Subunit: 204 residues, 2 copies
């Protein structure tokens, strides 16, 4: 529940990561090459919880998976998600199909995200892996933008089935404007800047 | 942001507070005498933030104050809120006007809530002060029920003025059903029970 108290180590990593990303961004914006993703539990009551695993960029959702009740993302499933995500990017993002742009990948450091096999796949796919700070959902567009917007809408839902969840998810992602996804990604520099100006603390 | 990690002290206080409240509740339910309250920041953009201070029971909102932009609740203002809250209870809750029931008061231990002057006023008013655990919004009906429901609705708002906030607040509190407030309060024992069964941890 209540807000994690950052320690010195944590605030130092945040501040320093934000400085590095912000000075890079000022040299040359890279925001349009960011693909980012995160997992979120969705709860339904049967006549239970599924994990939503979703990846997106400034043009919209690229790929997602709703995992079967109770089941979880471990190192092996995540590696398989990335391989599928890549197949979906190739189909939905011609810029990358044509390898005229390298993907910049923004995910958190959940353990399944840094297992040996996942690291290997990431190198093979050869996406640039952006550094991500400990305890920083305020710097993760999936959390501060996508799932923040989604959680509100989901509050009013009482899902009946795994497949209702899926139905609701399809409509919800589609009814969002292109410019909704773009704003989510393009808010990053403002947040990196707030984070530097707080010295790595959480911010307003 | 991300969820406070409870330490041993904290989980012990939660577990033990919940045991005490739950065995009392099983001996004789006292839930209908609970008046509870909390503060929440509401943000508006002028052509800024106000603190909502609100108190309620199972029949609805009793009293609230929206403080002027940036201003804060210190020991002296809180004492003055309680005196006003009491005037409002007397007007809106005849059971208590007629002193056939003692108020059970549920608030957190923010420092302004435990200043010397506030403690004195609480004794004078003679409300029973329920023990409240450190870092326990999951056990505070204002947080898990009232402000959880409100935050969603507020997400869609872009307030223009202190007085829009106030207008929205009046309508919002009034459009809630009686049974909405009742459920908020009457969910307590379930939560105390979850908290005991987690041994003082946060729960699902
Ligand atoms: Mg995550
Ligand atoms: Mg509080």
């Amino acid at each position: 529940w209540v807000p994690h108290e950052l320690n010195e180590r944590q605030m130092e990593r945040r501040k320093n990561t934000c400085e590095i990303l912000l000075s890079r961004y000022k040299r040359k914006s890279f925001l349009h090459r960011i693909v980012t993703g995160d997992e979120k539990w969705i709860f339904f009551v049967n006549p239970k919880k599924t994990m939503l695993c979703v990846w997106w960029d400034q043009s919209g959702v690229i790929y997602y998976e709703l995992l079967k009740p109770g089941e979880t993302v471990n190192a092996a499933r995540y590696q398989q998600q990335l391989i599928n995500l890549n197949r979906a990017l190739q189909r939905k993002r011609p810029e990358y199909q044509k390898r005229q742009h390298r993907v910049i990948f923004l995910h958190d450091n959940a353990p399944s995200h840094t297992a040996r096999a996942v690291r290997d796949t990431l190198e093979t796919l050869n996406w640039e892996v952006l550094p991500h700070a400990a305890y920083s959902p305020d710097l993760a567009p999936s959390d501060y933008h996508l799932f923040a917007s989604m959680g509100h809408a989901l509050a009013e839902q009482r899902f009946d089935s795994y497949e209702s969840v899926k139905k609701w998810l399809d409509e919800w992602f589609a009814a969002k404007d292109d410019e909704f996804y773009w704003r989510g990604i393009h808010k990053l520099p403002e947040r990196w800047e707030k984070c530097v100006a707080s010295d790595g603390k959480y911010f307003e």
